[PDB]
Amino acid sequence: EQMRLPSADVYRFAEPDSEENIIFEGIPIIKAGTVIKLIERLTYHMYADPNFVRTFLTTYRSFCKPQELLSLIIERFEIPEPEPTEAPLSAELKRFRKEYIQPVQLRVLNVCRHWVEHHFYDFERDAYLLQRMEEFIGTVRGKAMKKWVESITKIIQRKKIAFQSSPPTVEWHISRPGHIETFDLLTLHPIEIARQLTLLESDLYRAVQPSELVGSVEINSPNLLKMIRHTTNLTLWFEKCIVETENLEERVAVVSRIIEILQVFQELNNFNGVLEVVSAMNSSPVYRLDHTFEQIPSRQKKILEEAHELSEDHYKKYLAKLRSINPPCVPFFGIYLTNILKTEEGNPEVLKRHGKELINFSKRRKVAEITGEIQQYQNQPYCLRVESDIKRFFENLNPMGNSMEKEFTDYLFNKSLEIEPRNPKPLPRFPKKYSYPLKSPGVRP
């Protein structure tokens, strides 16, 4: 059964399995290994391993550069034949071609095909990486393998090239259409604020590739960064709109309008937006505004209290709602980032055996299983009309200005103490900052 393989100095993937290079947990599950050993099992001669191909291509950037992965799979493909025994039947050589060279070479090409189909951004970010891939597959000879080169070439071409019902009418309130200079929390219609923020957040959620969350929660993660900045900017914008409205009556109208935006986020199944509002309402500057929340109606308090209970017990009620909901939806994105940090903290980058270092692949596998849950909600377009001016208003939100986040939250907290001083101190009287009406048009379209 064991075949005659080429020398380890002429082919690096021929080294036997040992505790210095691979550790396993009916395909065996890899716990840890060197990059050479991971690449070997990624293109194993004995069997196909699509779950390992999927997980490896999502996580390898946390232990290997794309340029190194390409160099190593080319090295894996270029198998030298062992030296003959002075020779001819050539039984072991014919069998080495059939049972080792052919399956490994086919498996390298299957890894290339999965790499260009599901992770083309690696090639978009580095033109020379694509140039090397196209050059490598171009040197592949043989009819059976030219079919794999044709499919890889068609996928590269395809990647280079790249309503269910009638959407409802766009809603307007004080700010007339196109009057961008007046666009603000109380001047735009609360329904349209919630519809446009949902389209913005649905596009941002859909643009996040699973690999962007591996070993990182800039080039590596552009869409994750844009998603996190949006959530920070929108949450802090809600807080700023609340505490910078010093007049009690106007601040009640601001808080009440944000709760109405949350109701429409609930109707739209935008759980990301629901929990952005909850996060703003639970922040230290807002949560302590007892005089403000005293004037909020009971029905609006119930809405906000129930939206908070979605996060209790590690998001228990949220997960039940998400599963029981019909698309379209925008799932809460923060939970993936929390679970990835919980998985990665205290989890070692490497295992050490006999002075040698092995990459901890279990750590990468557990992160991939979390990120794999993101994609099932990324092909759910909303049946809502985009409003370019409102979208641009929410894209350019910059509440912090030049401040750093922590310092800005301390400013928000001190603004909260100015507008509602602590119990002994009197409640001051502040002038009105808005001359337009505060009455909401409601959440009914």
Ligand X SMILES: Cc1nc(N[C@H](C)c2cc(N)cc(C(F)(F)F)c2)c2ccccc2n1
278 near ligand X, judged by CB under 6 A: yes
**Residues whose CB is less than 8 angstroms from the CB of residue 431 and which lie 6 or more positions away in sequence, other chains included:** 246, 247
Nearer to ligand X, 260 or 387 (CB): 260
| Backbone torsion region of residue 294, taken as left when φ is above 0, otherwise alpha when ψ lies between -120 and 50, otherwise beta | alpha
Q: What's the Cα-to-Cα distance from 180 to each of 58, 216, 308, 343, 391, rounded to whole Å?
A: 42, 37, 33, 44, 11
CA atoms within 13 A on the CB side of 310: 26
Nearer to ligand X, 65 or 301 (CB): 301
| Tokens representing residue 293 in the block | 């929340």
294 near ligand X, judged by CB under 6 A: no
- Exactly one of 8, 147, 177, 287 binds ligand X (CB under 6 A); which one? 287
304 near ligand X, judged by CB under 6 A: yes
Q: What's the Cα-to-Cα distance from 438 to each of 100, 189, 336, 432, rounded to whole Å?
A: 75, 12, 38, 11
Mind spelling out the 3-state secondary structure of 117-175? Answer: HHCCHHHHCCHHHHHHHHHHHHCCCCHHHHHHHHHHHHHHHHHHHCCCCCCCCCCCCCC
**Residues whose CB is less than 8 angstroms from the CB of residue 119 and which lie 6 or more positions away in sequence, other chains included:** 57, 58, 209, 211
Nearer to ligand X, 22 or 335 (CB): 335
296 near ligand X, judged by CB under 6 A: yes
Q: What's the Cα-to-Cα distance from 307 to each of 57, 193, 254, 277, 331, rounded to whole Å?
A: 37, 18, 18, 9, 14
- Exactly one of 248, 274, 286, 310 binds ligand X (CB under 6 A); which one? 286
- Euclidean distance between CA atoms 422 and 416, whole angstroms: 10
308 near ligand X, judged by CB under 6 A: yes
Count of residues interacting with ligand X (CB under 6 A): 12
Q: Which stretch binds ligand X (CB under 6 A): 46-54, 71-79, 275-283, 399-407?
A: 275-283
282 near ligand X, judged by CB under 6 A: yes
Closest distance to ligand X from the beta carbon of 284 (Å): 10
Closest distance to ligand X from the beta carbon of 303 (Å): 8
Nearer to ligand X, 58 or 416 (CB): 416
95 near ligand X, judged by CB under 6 A: no
Q: Which stretch binds ligand X (CB under 6 A): 5-13, 46-54, 158-166, 301-309?
A: 301-309
- Exactly one of 281, 329, 359, 390 binds ligand X (CB under 6 A); which one? 281
Nearer to ligand X, 308 or 385 (CB): 308
Closest distance to ligand X from the beta carbon of 226 (Å): 26
String of DSSP letters for 185-206 = TTTS-HHHHHHHHHHHHHHHHH
Nearer to ligand X, 188 or 286 (CB): 286
Nearer to ligand X, 208 or 281 (CB): 281
Closest distance to ligand X from the beta carbon of 304 (Å): 4
- Euclidean distance between CA atoms 298 and 4, whole angstroms: 79
Handedness of CA 426, 278, 303, 183 (dihedral sign): positive
Nearer to ligand X, 276 or 344 (CB): 276
- Phi and psi dihedrals of 84, rounded to 5? -65, 160
Closest distance to ligand X from the beta carbon of 263 (Å): 13
Subset of residues 316 to 375 that bind ligand X, contact rule: CB under 6 A: none
**Residues whose CB is less than 8 angstroms from the CB of residue 104 and which lie 6 or more positions away in sequence, other chains included:** 43, 44, 45, 76, 77, 79
254 near ligand X, judged by CB under 6 A: no
293 near ligand X, judged by CB under 6 A: yes
124 near ligand X, judged by CB under 6 A: no
436 near ligand X, judged by CB under 6 A: no
List of residues contacting ligand X (CB under 6 A): 278, 281-282, 286-287, 293, 296, 301, 304-305, 308-309
